[PDB]
Design a protein around this ligand. Structure first.
Ligand SMILES: [Ca+2]
Ligand SMILES: [Ca+2]
Ligand SMILES: [Ca+2]
Ligand SMILES: [Ca+2]
Ligand SMILES: [Ca+2]
Ligand SMILES: [Ca+2]
Ligand SMILES: [Ca+2]
Ligand SMILES: [Ca+2]
Lengths: 395, 395
């Protein structure tokens, strides 16, 4: 490569480095004290079909509905993982949405109490974009312990006149997971049950804007998000009215695979508080016969610890487990997993070894259920699981 | 999938999660006050040819050679990236080694002054493993500003009787990069120029052990590491004497590609202190026409900030740039990079736009050199770079 190409590479690397650094779409929150609430600013990148991105610049204000005291936070952010899919049995225009949201950015009430378990959610939106009126209704549930939202939305007026992904931020941030050390900065939950008003302007670069106002509050045991949206100045053949935005990707974990990981997570998180501490991680590792030091345990957690709280929460765990792996590395991971099961290292996992491994993990199973696991894997019928049989179960 | 397979998946995920969490091989350091030095503990995982891992449990003590005062640290660790390769022109049994080492684990002198620039290194080792005597000599240089070591080792007695990778930890931790907030915890540099004694026991699981003693000190301007190694109890057909350990991998960045990234890094790190601050990152981004907020800049850096010092150092930058990317994501990254160069967005990068982009990055080039870059990319000879021509330069 000549000196010219060397200069392209060098300068290309620098420009691509900025791209990678700034690929974040986090929700930046600050206090708006004179309105007794908060403001937020963030940038959504909507993938355009067949390449490119449509920027959506979000400006947000929240103010409490009630008169009682709320918590006004220091600067921090929310980080969001979204998965959009379709219900194969649904003929109406619709969106199935799975979302994990966590707070971070700050280093180590009666409202919070309303979010300790699973909470039913209702969403109603009436919209008007360039004169095109439409409504959406949504239902599902939130589980703030895991920063989790699962909802299904239906366009109740027929065909949605804008792309589903453009409505996602508009369609309940009280379901975000705030770590313990940030509980004093959780405005959203502190305003409950009376609720808050959420207002946004969303500017679509080189296109129109949405203006939204929403009431977010409890009606009985249900968290309700009632929204009005007004969109103006949109181009008839732009990305929005022209439906040129990508709905989702195939490279996303199934909602079912995510559930499997949540199950696995629970084996570590034995008190169900939504975290794995060094204590909990060490307990499982010691049960399996390993002996990590306290420094190692702290280090292992720190490595995947996005919010810096010193523990692994479920979205952090999911991020680690969704990490895409080289086939050679995948093979080594499975090979090493086999050794954990195969306690005496003779190359066969016996029914007894499997029973003990289940017990070590805190997986409660009858001996019969363990024999059924053996049966599932046992190709040659010797009543035990060899390496190749185990490989099939990890594949 | 039946309930049995569901249980395999769940339990498999948990065991594989432990594997991923504990894949770290960091060097855990603590003070050894009664010896006026330090101790370290860590575990090296040597890949075995065709699968599996050979564990090497390391125990380490360091004590100062001189009588003057040294710095005794709080608990922390070193994180190491190693690349082993071969010199195609070298017929002697040899190892070319490239290493980046950084300190971390603690949250936000005349010895340190000896390491601000590039320092020549000499390494001499006399070894005796199971009666097999051998020597190794090494030479190269260390650049602690980047946590960088580059050395070439030769077996001066003929054929090395053990695998090269087993000698790596034995063959100068004063070259590790300690962030500013941890400078008081850098024992290694503080003992210079007089040096320190480094002793280890290295236990190879199911095999023999090495016992090493080394003198690490300045002789004139050269940092010298003089070592004696004794290995006993090794199995003639084990991984070590039987040479069954993997030397390296093909999935590693070239030493030349790494140099390209170091060049790109310098465009951000304009004061050459080995970090990129928010100030420096923002300065480059603003020059290119972008306007990240202070919260965004802090967030972008925090995302890749392994040592928590609030800045990007070179090994952190390399980790981000060595991140392996989906072809669809790679394509989008290049597409977005094109837009940065193509200032007016007309789909052609003109000579003027390229000149400005170079200036914006702080890349000093004559206009002639910029025309030569154009010429390199310019397939259709219109004197400008279109998207497809630019793609070729990023590929
Ligand atoms: Ca827990
Ligand atoms: Ca955490
Ligand atoms: Ca066994
Ligand atoms: Ca079998
Ligand atoms: Ca700098
Ligand atoms: Ca850093
Ligand atoms: Ca142009
Ligand atoms: Ca051209």
């Amino acid at each position: 490569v000549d000196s010219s190409r060397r200069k392209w590479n060098k300068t290309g690397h620098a420009v691509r480095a900025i791209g990678r650094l700034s690929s974040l779409e986090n929700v930046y929150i600050k206090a708006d004290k004179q309105k007794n609430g908060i403001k937020a600013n963030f940038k959504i990148r909507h993938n355009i079909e067949d390449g490119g991105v449509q920027l959506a610049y979000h400006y947000q204000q929240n103010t409490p509905i009630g008169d009682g005291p709320v918590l006004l936070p220091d600067n921090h952010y929310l980080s969001v993982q979204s998965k959009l899919s379709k219900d194969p049995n649904e003929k109406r225009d619709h969106m199935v949405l799975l979302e994990f949201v966590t707070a971070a950015g700050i280093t180590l009430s009666k409202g919070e109490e309303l979010f300790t378990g699973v909470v039913p959610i209702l969403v109603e939106l009436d919209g008007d974009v360039n004169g095109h009126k439409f409504s959406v209704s949504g239902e599902g549930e939130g589980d703030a312990t895991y920063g989790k939202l699962t909802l299904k939305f239906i366009c109740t007026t027929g065909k949605l006149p804008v792309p589903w992904p453009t409505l996602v931020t508009t369609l309940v941030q009280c379901f975000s997971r705030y770590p313990d050390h940030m509980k004093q900065h959780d405005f959203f939950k502190s305003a409950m049950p009376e609720g808050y008003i959420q207002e946004r302007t969303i500017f679509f670069k080189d296109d129109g804007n949405y203006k939204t106002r929403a009431e977010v509050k409890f009606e009985g045991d249900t968290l309700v998000n009632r929204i009005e949206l007004k969109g103006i100045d949109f181009k008839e053949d732009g990305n929005i009215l022209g439906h040129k935005l990508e709905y989702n990707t195939r490279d996303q974990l199934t909602e079912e695979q995510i559930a499997e990981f949540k199950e696995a997570f629970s084996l570590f998180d034995k008190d169900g508080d939504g975290t794995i501490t060094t204590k909990e991680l060490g307990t499982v590792m010691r049960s399996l016969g390993q002996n990590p030091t306290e420094a190692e345990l702290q280090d292992m957690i720190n490595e995947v610890d996005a919010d810096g709280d010193g523990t692994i929460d479920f979205p952090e765990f999911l991020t680690m487990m969704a990490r895409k792996m080289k086939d050679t590395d995948s093979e080594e991971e499975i090979r090493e997993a086999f050794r954990v099961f195969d306690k005496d290292g003779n190359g066969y996992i016996s029914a007894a070894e499997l029973r003990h491994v289940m017990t070590n993990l805190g997986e409660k199973l009858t001996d019969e259920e363990v024999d059924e696991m053996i049966r599932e894997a046992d190709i040659d019928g010797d009543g035990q699981v060899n390496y190749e049989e185990f490989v099939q179960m990890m594949t």
